[PDB]
Structures are given as C-alpha cells and as structure tokens.
Paper text:
In the wild-type CS, side chain of M120 interacts with the main-chain amino group of S70 and main-chain carboxyl group of A69 of “TSGNT” loop at 3.8 Å and 3.7 Å, respectively. Conformations of both α5-β4 loop of active site entrance and substrate/inhibitor binding “TSGNT” loop are altered in the M120A and M92 AM120A structures. Mutation of M120 disrupts the interaction between S70 and A68 of the peptide loop and pushing the loop ∼3.8 Å further away to postbinding conformation. This reduces the chances of incoming inhibitor to latch onto the binding loop as compared with reference conformation present in the wild-type, thus reducing the affinity of inhibitor. On-rate binding constants of mutants of HiM120A, HiM92A, and HiM120 AM92A are ∼286-fold, 80-fold, and 200-fold lower than that of HiCS wild-type. In HiCS, M120 favors substrate binding by a factor of ∼858-fold as M120A mutation reduces the rate of substrate binding by 286-fold and peptide binding by threefold. M120A mutation reduced the affinity for inhibitor peptides by 3, 5, and 1.4-fold in HiCS, StCS, and MtCS, although the reduction in MtCS was statistically insignificant. In the absence of substrate, M120 interaction with inhibitor/substrate binding “TSGNT” loop stabilizes the CS·Inhibitor complex, but M120 disengages the “TSGNT” loop as soon as it senses the substrate at the active site entrance.
O-acetyl serine sulfhydrylase (OASS), referred to as cysteine synthase (CS), synthesizes cysteine from O-acetyl serine (OAS) and sulfur in bacteria and plants. The inherent challenge for CS is to overcome 4 to 6 log-folds stronger affinity for its natural inhibitor, serine acetyltransferase (SAT), as compared with its affinity for substrate, OAS. Our recent study showed that CS employs a novel competitive-allosteric mechanism to selectively recruit its substrate in the presence of natural inhibitor. Results show that CS uses a noncatalytic residue, M120, located 20 Å away from the reaction center, to discriminate in favor of substrate.
Author numbering:
A (entry chain X), B (entry chain X): 2 to 314
Write the structure that this text describes.
C-alpha cells in the first residue's frame, strides 16, 4: 500500500537464516535495521506518539521533549517530523558531531547540557523543560511507557510468528528498555499460545537481570554494547515472561557483529553481535538442536562507523 | 518467510506519500534505503551474482573484482559475503577512511590505486587484475550487465504496480547506470501494459541525456549528486522508454534531501533529493494534477554524514 506518513511504514522486517552460526541452520535473524529511521526503535517512536495522540496527551501544538541521542531519539525525531511536531532532545555537549548533525538534519531542537553531568544532566534538563510548561511539553518515557512493548506485541511478535509459520521455538533479544522481548513474548506465548523459550541478553559487565533473578547485589558496570545494559530493571521488562538470561562480553559482541558483516553479509550493529553470540551458544547445546532460534538484530552497521566496531578493522 | 541468505531478502520497499511536496498528495516515494546493504543497488548486486552463477561465469572459487566504492561496491560486498565469494574492490587511495572501513568490515580485499588517477586508475587496475587470470576473476560490469535492469523489471517495477494497485501514472528516477528507470519502465509499460510517463533525472551540471536527445554536443561536468550523472549514456539506459528528462542542480538536490528529513521524517540520500525536486516540479504542473507520481529514493541519509548533505546543517 501507500503509507500516509513514514511512521506507518514501520516493521515487516525480514528473517535471514545464518550459515556460519548455530547448528544446521537453527539460528535465524530478524533485521530491525530495515525500518524508517533504521532501528528497532522506529516501532516504539511511532507507537508512543500514536498512543499519546489517542490518549489526548499529545495534541496539535504540543512539543515532544526527551533526553536521548540514541536510536530512540532518532526514532522520535523522524516521527515528530513526519507528523508535524516540534521536538527537543537534550544530551551532553560532549555528543559526537555526526549524531548532532543527524538529529539537526531531522529538524530536532538540540539542547546541550553540561558535559560533566552525562546522561543524568540531560535527563534533568528535559524534566526541567517539561516542568516549565507541562501544558506545552510531553515526555514519552521509553523505559516505562507501555506503548513500547505494546507495539512489539502487535507487530514484531506476529511478524515472527507468521514468517516462521509458528515454528519459532526460542526468541533471543538484548534488553534495553525490555520492550522487544516483553512484547514479542506476550504475542507468541499469550496470543498465539506457544510455550517458547524467551532469552534476555545483557552484558556480562552489567548483568543486573541475572543478579536480580539470583537475589544477588545489583552491580551495574560500563560496557560497549550500545543499546542494552542500562544498569537497572526497566518497567517495560516483564520478568515473568523471561525464561533464561544470557550474558555476553563487549569484545565478543563486537567480534560477532564483525563476523556477521564479513561472513554473512549482514550489516549488524553492536548489540546485534551480542544477541547472535548468545544465540550461537544456545544453538550449540543439544537441547536446542532441533529448535528454531529467532534473534532480534536491533540496528545497522553504518550507525557505528566511529565506534570500536570499525576501529582497527 | 526465511531467506536462505541476505541476498534473497532484497526489495519489497515501502511507498510513502509526501505531505510537503506535490499537490494534494500526488507524490509518493519508494524507500530503497530499506534493503540488505541499504540502497537500491542491493537488488543488482544480488541479481548480477545470481545470473553469473546461472550462466556459469561465476563458480565456486572464482573471485569478484570491481572498481566501485559506492553503493554498488557495498552491494557486491554483502552479496559476496552472503554467498561465500572473495571480492576485490579497487579504488583511489584518496577514498574516505569510513568507506574503507565499511568495505573492510564486509570482508572486501581493498586495492588502493594511485590518487592522481582517480576512478580511471581504479578501473584500469581492476581490468589488469582480471586480465592477470581471467579463469579466476569476474567483473560484473553494472553499466552494461542486463541482469541490472532485469532485477528492476522483476522486482522494483512489480512492487510499484502492486503497491499502487496499478494507479501509478509517472515514474521519476535519477539515472546512474539507468537500470532502475529501464527495468521499472519495462515492467509497467510492457508487462502490465500501462502507458505511464517515465522521467529520467540528471544533474543540470552534467545533462548528457538531455544533450544527446537534443542532438547537442555532449558536455559532462562535475556535480555533487552522488549516484547519478555518470557523464555518459550507459548501456543499461534504454532511451526508447524515456518520455521526459528533468535536470536538477546540486544545491537544490541537497536542500531537498534536507527538507525530506526535517519536513517528512524521511532519511533520504542526496540523489533522493534530486529525484523529489524533479518530481515536485512535475507535480505542480496542471497536466499532472490528477496523476500519481512515484519517485525512487535510492539511498539513506547516514551514508552521507561526511558530505555536503550535513555540512553546515
């Protein structure tokens, strides 16, 4: 059909079988880089705006404010442009020129907060701007907004079900906001009624889901797997549908994304490498020999050209 | 379904209606950035390899050689990786570090030719490598290989026909190799039998198609619209199916791509801006008031972050 604006074109991303991972083709990847602003977040940028519209919280003239410069910021930016909203994104003055340019290109009002304050300083500023005129500004809050996992339950999940003809046995997804694994798992286990294994992936450097579930002291840590490992349990992560948590280290995630490019011809991002590394480990366990493992690849390689993904390559 | 490798996932790109161009929504764009290596060329990288396989010109152990660092080089790179071929790309030593990294990431053997020799020096070197052992090397030749327009006749064209329910009246496409407009036009005019208007787009700086058709001295010139305006009439441009040629200047192409980003939320590349600028001009002629104009957008914005598209933004 013909989409009325770019937000409506979200999803319908392809599944590609891996040849150099898994065992006898039991690992299949879902390419979320193929989306209107080239990541999985395009789905939630679209649906958080749509739902806010339906709820009356977003109206003509009101402006979006958020504190992200990552995939969600880019997603909200294209949606704001497509649907005629002003958007302000806050972020530390220390952000890359290339990302500022991308966001400025999409028409975003950039508010650069103090470098020394990092992400926290940006979050504060966004909240202070919203507090300045709550009748004018709306913060959509990707970590707790249920419209996030809801779009995955309505789109990403049913796409996996349909493209595998219901044969999917395992879903492997890195957890950032938790929306993907939550929505996908709700779709497949509840709407389609299949008792699959839902695998959350997190960095070994910041294994807060593993620590939580084990009743251990929660100890986040720095890592390089962009998009996952936020260092807390997000509200949009439904722990009740998680069957297994796999941890992956930053180096192996990076190495795996590079293997995806050079061995599979798949331009995967960093967290995509992490997710495939976790899935490859499961795929080589005899218990998963006859099981179809579907892996979310959240983003595309070119978004990481100034990162360690290509540094030294 | 589940694609056996990434090359099979080509195409099925969405159509999005423009709100700030055209008149009463008569301009619709086809997003070719949504492809396995993120450009229209993914289709021809796939099909030139497939056809060479079918023809017996490409076999296990033979290696691809070409002289491109652009979208076609990236396309051939992902296909070579996906299907297990070694690939050598030649290009001037003066190429960006970011593009070298991308290609190295995809597993390409880079051969850097002398800076002073430009594209010609790279073409020579590729030809010299092929000449060195013609039993080992294959050059697929995007400007003359009929597998290029053929994939557009089999995929891009029928996608436009189906997504518009046969209502497409005009196709607007920048000409690089000519494959897109040629294949699309053959599909719609010959296979589906509709007498549409096929519009080739070229830079006003290098208007060789316009000059040729007018019987004027052919005078190429430099421009910034990457991907089009090769400065000659390619063999894969079928002049017999071109109804109209529109010229667009580099500044307006750039400005238009920026308008696509900020006003439509569409992350278009430079040549996408050129194609929409040409289509917008036609769309505002009363003769095209009631006509559905479909525009090819060959690539995505992030591939141009170090270009004039974002410089000064």
């Amino acid at each position: 059909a013909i989409y009325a604006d770019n937000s409506y074109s979200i999803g319908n991303t392809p599944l590609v079988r891996l040849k150099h991972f898994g065992h006898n083709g039991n690992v299949v990847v879902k390419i979320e880089g193929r989306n209107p602003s080239y990541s999985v977040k395009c789905r939630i940028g679209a649906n958080m705006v749509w739902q806010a519209e339906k709820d009356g919280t977003l109206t003509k003239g009101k402006e979006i404010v958020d504190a992200t410069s990552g995939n969600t910021g880019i997603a909200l930016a294209y949606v704001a442009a497509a649907r005629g909203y002003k958007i302000t994104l806050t972020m530390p003055e220390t952000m890359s020129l290339e990302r500022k340019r991308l966001l400025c290109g999409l028409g975003v009002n950039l508010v650069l907060t103090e470098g020394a304050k990092g992400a926290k300083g940006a979050i504060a500023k966004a909240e202070e701007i919203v507090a300045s005129d709550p009748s004018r500004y709306v913060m959509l809050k990707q970590f707790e907004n249920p419209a996030n996992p809801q779009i995955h339950r309505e789109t990403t999940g049913p796409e996996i079900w349909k493209d595998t003809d219901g044969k999917v046995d395992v879903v492997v997804a890195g957890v950032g906001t938790g929306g993907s694994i939550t929505g996908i798992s709700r779709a497949i286990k509840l709407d389609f009624g299949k008792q699959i294994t839902s695998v959350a992936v997190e960095p070994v450097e910041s294994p807060v889901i593993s620590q939580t579930l084990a009743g251990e002291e929660v100890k986040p840590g720095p890592h390089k797997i962009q998009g996952i490992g936020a260092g807390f349990i997000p509200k949009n992560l439904d722990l009740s549908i998680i069957d297994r948590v796999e941890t992956v280290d930053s180096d192996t995630a990076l190495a795996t994304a590079r293997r995806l490019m050079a061995e599979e011809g798949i331009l995967a991002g960093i967290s995509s490498g992490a997710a495939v590394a976790a899935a490859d480990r499961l795929a080589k366990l005899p218990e998963f020999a006859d099981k179809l493992i579907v892996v979310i690849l959240p983003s595309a390689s070119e978004r990481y050209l100034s990162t360690a993904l290509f540094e030294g390559i």
